């Protein structure tokens, strides 16, 4: 579970980054306002070292796993374009610091579909996964994902008069290794 208050993209073999197409480094991507990094880091900063560990040649998951194990304060060295060619190497110190989401509800229902909602939180989440299946059933769940900016989803193709269990998972990383405690409801169509 995140406590530095920013996201990263990039890494060798990763999904790339929105700043520099041909650079496989690690880049600060979104920064939580009023979070630990808010005065110090900005989108597009390339992380080259953290607590003495090189982030050159590192894979995405390796970077995430390293950053997550660091205790308390994290010293980062980043490269920032200022930037007509011009570059700065900046050393900063960032001090780390239920379910996600909360208040899962059905807003509207038809005999074969449900519109669900949950509380919008626009930071800390890479994407949501929504699962649904017959309550107590043994078949694999059906599922889909929605972006971090969503606080509603429509579930379609349901059987009328059947009990369903609906669960929402909020993943902090894009590769789906960490989710927060999920939230579920039961609903009968």
């Amino acid at each position: 579970s995140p406590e530095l208050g920013f996201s990263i993209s990039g890494g060798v073999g990763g999904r790339g980054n929105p700043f520099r197409p041909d650079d496989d480094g690690i880049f600060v991507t979104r920064v939580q306002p009023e979070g630990p990094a808010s005065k110090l880091l900005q989108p597009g900063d390339k992380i080259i070292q953290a607590n003495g560990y090189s982030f050159i040649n590192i894979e995405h998951g390796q970077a995430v796993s390293l950053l997550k194990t660091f205790q308390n304060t994290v010293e980062l060295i980043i490269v920032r374009e200022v930037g007509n060619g011009a570059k700065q190497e900046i050393r900063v110190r960032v001090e780390k610091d239920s379910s996600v989401p909360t208040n899962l509800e059905v807003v509207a229902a038809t005999p074969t579909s449900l519109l669900i909602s949950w509380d919008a939180s626009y930071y800390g989440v890479s994407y949501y996964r929504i699962t649904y299946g017959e309550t107590g059933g043994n078949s694999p769940v059906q599922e889909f994902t929605v972006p971090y900016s969503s606080s509603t989803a429509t579930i379609s193709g349901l059987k009328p008069g059947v009990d369903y269990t609906i669960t929402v998972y909020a993943y902090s990383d894009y590769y789906g290794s960490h989710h927060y405690s999920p939230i579920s409801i039961n609903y009968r169509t």
Partner: peptide, 8 residues
């Protein structure tokens, strides 16, 4: 699109 970032 699918995300390309992870929170730390």
């Amino acid at each position: 699109p699918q995300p390309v970032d992870s929170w730390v």
